[PDB]
Amino acid sequence: RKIRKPFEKLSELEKQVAGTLLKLEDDPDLREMGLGTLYISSVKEIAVDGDKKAAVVYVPYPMLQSFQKNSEALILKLEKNHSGHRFIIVANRTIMKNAYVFTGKKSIRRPRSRTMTSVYNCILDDICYPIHVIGKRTLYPAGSNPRLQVVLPKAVYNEVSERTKTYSAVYKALTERDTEFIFM
RNA sequence: CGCCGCGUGGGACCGCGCAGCGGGCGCGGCGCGCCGCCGCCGCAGCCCCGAGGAGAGCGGGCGGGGGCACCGGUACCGGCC
Known part of the structure; x- marks a missing residue:
């Protein structure tokens, strides 16, 4: 029964992560808020560039903000329990296709x-929930x-210098764009 | 045969769409949609942003801008000693 945190039957990786989450409520390491009956949905195993492969944890959108109240406590605990992966929380928000859907009677x-x-x-905001983007210039270079490009404050740069490689590669998975990061 | 007709395709540009959906009942009088009815637990249910557009606001100075009343100063002209 690893069913207390995730949903349905999945591959080997998610069940272990569910175990960290079961002990995570038990450990009150700054994660007492919200946790206790906070549940997840899916995990993406993405091989990020040359960095340690960073997996994503899709968290239901209604429970996303409460989950990330102290986002640092989730990522550091998760890494220690399952080393090798820099985990990133993403709400499973959905794109709806068709701006207007015509049923004939009504759109x-x-x-x-x-x-x-x-x-x-x-999606970018979930990749860096603690750090707010200063600006997002897009470079359409000469060769197509x-x-x-994402600009963030230089004050947080030293911390996220290492974690930018997992963030850019995971956003390449979530979005086709070749996202790159820079600092003020 | 200019054909603003029609048929099929495309849908960039161009405008323009207020209403919640979805499940089931259900083969609703040869198949379906209606049309209902039940929260029925399946929706992240339901907000682009905020124009060196525009209106509104507050603050702080600005000016022979407008009105209205009051008024002062010589000068010109007139009447005096």
């Missing part, structure tokens, strides 16, 4: 947050292949 329409442009920007 039901799509909400704004369910669109690719709205979803992608919200647009690359997203």
